[PDB]
C-alpha cells in the first residue's frame, strides 16, 4: 500500500543497516541487457554506500 | 530538477531549471531595448498625434 520497499544485501551476506524506497520503475527496457532498470533510493547517513558496488 | 522521476508528465510542463542567470540577462537586455524602442516610438507616436491636429 506504500510504494515500495527494497533492502540491500552486499557482499557480506547480512542486510544493510536500513532500507528504503523503490522510487520508480523504468519502462524503457535497455536494448543490450533486455532488462528494466528500477531505481531504489536509500538513505545513507553513514557513507557506507558507495556509488557503484 | 522539478519533476518526479518515473511519473507521467504532460506537454510543456516546465520541470527543469537550467540556470536562468545568463538568459535572464539577455532577456533583460532585450526587454530593456524594447523600452528603448517603445519610448522612442512613444514620442514618435506623439509627434504624429501632435502633428495630426
From Swiss-Prot, chain A:
Q: Where in the cell is it found?
A: Cell inner membrane
**Superkingdom field:** Bacteria
How is the quaternary structure described?
Monomeric in solution. Homotrimeric; interacts independently with AcrB and TolC as well as AcrZ. Part of the AcrA-AcrB-TolC efflux pump. Complex assembly is independent of an efflux substrate and appears to be constitutive.
Could you tell me what this protein is called? Multidrug efflux pump subunit AcrA
Describe the function of this protein.
Answer: AcrA-AcrB-AcrZ-TolC is a drug efflux protein complex with broad substrate specificity that uses the proton motive force to export substrates. This subunit may act as an adapter protein that links AcrB and TolC stably together. It is elongated in shape, being long enough to span the periplasm.
The consequence of inactivating this gene is: Cannot grow on efflux substrates novobiocin or fusidic acid.
Full-protein positions shown: 239 to 291 of 397
| UniProt similarity note | Belongs to the membrane fusion protein (MFP) (TC 8.A.1) family.
Amino acid at each position: 500500500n506504500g510504494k515500495a520497499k527494497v533492502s540491500l544485501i552486499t557482499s557480506d551476506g547480512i542486510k544493510f543497516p536500513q532500507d528504503g524506497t523503490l522510487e520508480f520503475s523504468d519502462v524503457t527496457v535497455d536494448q543490450t541487457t533486455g532488462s528494466i532498470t528500477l531505481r531504489a533510493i536509500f538513505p545513507n547517513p553513514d557513507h557506507t554506500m558507495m556509488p557503484g558496488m | 530538477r522539478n519533476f518526479k522521476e518515473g511519473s507521467d508528465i504532460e506537454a510543456g510542463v516546465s520541470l527543469y531549471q537550467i540556470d536562468p542567470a545568463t538568459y535572464q540577462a539577455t532577456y533583460d537586455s532585450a526587454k530593456g531595448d524594447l523600452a528603448k524602442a517603445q519610448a522612442a516610438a512613444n514620442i514618435a507616436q506623439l509627434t504624429v498625434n501632435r502633428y495630426q491636429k
